[PDB]
């Protein structure tokens, strides 16, 4: 367009040329601007000690000088100049500013993820940006897209009135599928909205994925683990009901309750071929249907 887009870094000097203006007096040029400070079209006098002389000053060559540009300096800057020949020359600038935040961080990141359930992997944080910008995630070296799979992100943006800069937060939530990557690798990046800029990337994190064994209401454990023992000796059957303080445990052999009193443990010493068969325990309870543990096969080897 006619207006030239200017992109300046906050806190840095900026010079705007008044094109087609004589280097030395006499000059016939005038600056008109409209920024966040003025909230209106104002003429900027070339004389020293003006209302804005601490923020913007006209240079001897007609160029406009801002020693330390700020967010409030965003707006339109126009110079109208007559050459000495002399034809009217116009300069139209649209000034936008920016600040790059420090390297983003991942805070409160999880060392271990639990498969099958939502986990907060961590929260990416970015402080001191203008404009806001955006945070995104990477998984195993590739962009991680949200709301697919069981991957969700909670984002928020906060502006500091004290400086006008932004604080960004991105909380990553994943539900690891069973049989998946035992060590997923995540990283976070900040993408400036201005200017066009290479992303600022965090160091990667590599949480581990733990896959919990399916929890049975009635848990049976047999030593030895296999359920096979040489002739003689002993096999101990222990079974437990985690949700009950005083479980009543009745032992069964091949689907039939054994002629025994309730007991959490059943030891089978001096194992003979007659002692072979499928074993399990049944937890009974008042006002509730009984529950059975997993069935264990007990045999003998030669």
């Amino acid at each position: 367009a006619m207006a030239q887009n200017i992109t300046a870094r906050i806190g840095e000097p900026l010079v705007l040329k008044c094109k087609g203006a004589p280097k030395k007096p006499p000059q016939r040029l005038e600056w008109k601007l409209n920024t966040g400070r003025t909230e209106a079209w104002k003429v900027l006098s070339p004389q020293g000690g003006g209302p804005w002389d601490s923020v913007a000053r006209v240079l001897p060559n007609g160029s406009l000088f801002l020693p330390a540009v700020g967010i409030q300096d965003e707006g339109i800057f126009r110079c109208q100049a007559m050459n000495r020949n002399g034809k009217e020359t116009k300069s139209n600038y649209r000034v936008r500013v920016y600040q790059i935040p420090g390297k983003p961080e991942i805070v409160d990141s999880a060392s271990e993820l639990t498969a099958g359930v939502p986990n907060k992997v961590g929260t990416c944080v970015s402080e001191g940006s203008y404009p806001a910008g955006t945070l995104s995630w990477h998984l195993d070296g590739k962009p991680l897209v949200p709301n697919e799979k069981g991957v969700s992100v909670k984002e928020q943006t906060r502006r500091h009135p004290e400086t006008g800069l932004f604080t960004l937060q991105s909380e990553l939530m994943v539900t690891p599928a069973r049989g998946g990557d035992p060590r997923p690798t995540f990283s976070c990046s900040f993408s400036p909205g201005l200017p066009r800029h290479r992303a600022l990337r965090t160091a990667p994190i590599q949480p581990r994925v733990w896959e919990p064994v399916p929890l049975e209401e009635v848990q049976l454990v047999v030593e030895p683990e296999g359920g096979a023992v040489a002739p003689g000796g002993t096999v101990t059957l222990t079974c437990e009901v985690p949700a009950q303080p005083s479980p009543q445990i009745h032992w069964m052999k091949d689907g039939v309750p054994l002629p025994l009193p309730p007991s959490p443990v059943l030891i089978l010493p001096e194992i003979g071929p007659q002692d072979q068969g499928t074993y399990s325990c049944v937890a009974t309870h008042s006002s509730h249907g009984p529950q059975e543990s997993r069935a264990v096969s007990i045999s003998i080897i030669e």
Binding site: S111, D181, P182, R183, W210, E211, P212, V213, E225
Partner: protein, 89 residues
């Protein structure tokens, strides 16, 4: 498919298989660790009770009588090179 993924998934499963038996479900008691070593690791078959006790003591660095995943990982790291020498000759 990936043999790496399977081995790593296994070491995580093995840790929690024993760590979740008593006390803190994500750390190995002396009892839990000894069962792990004797039942899952080759190096533990030849070791005697005194040797296993000395080994478990050197795995518990902060001396809380527990072995966490970190203390367990460095154990496997050492084991990898110890096994590596044995596979030479």
């Amino acid at each position: 498919a990936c043999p790496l993924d399977q081995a790593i998934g296994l070491l995580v499963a093995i840790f929690h298989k024993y760590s979740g038996r008593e006390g803190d479900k994500h750390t190995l008691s002396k009892k839990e660790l000894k069962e792990l070593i004797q039942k899952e690791l080759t190096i533990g078959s030849k070791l005697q009770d005194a040797e296993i006790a000395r080994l478990m003591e050197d795995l518990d660095r902060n001396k809380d009588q527990e072995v966490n995943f970190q203390e367990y990982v460095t154990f496997l790291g050492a084991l990898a090179l110890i096994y590596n020498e044995a596979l030479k000759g």
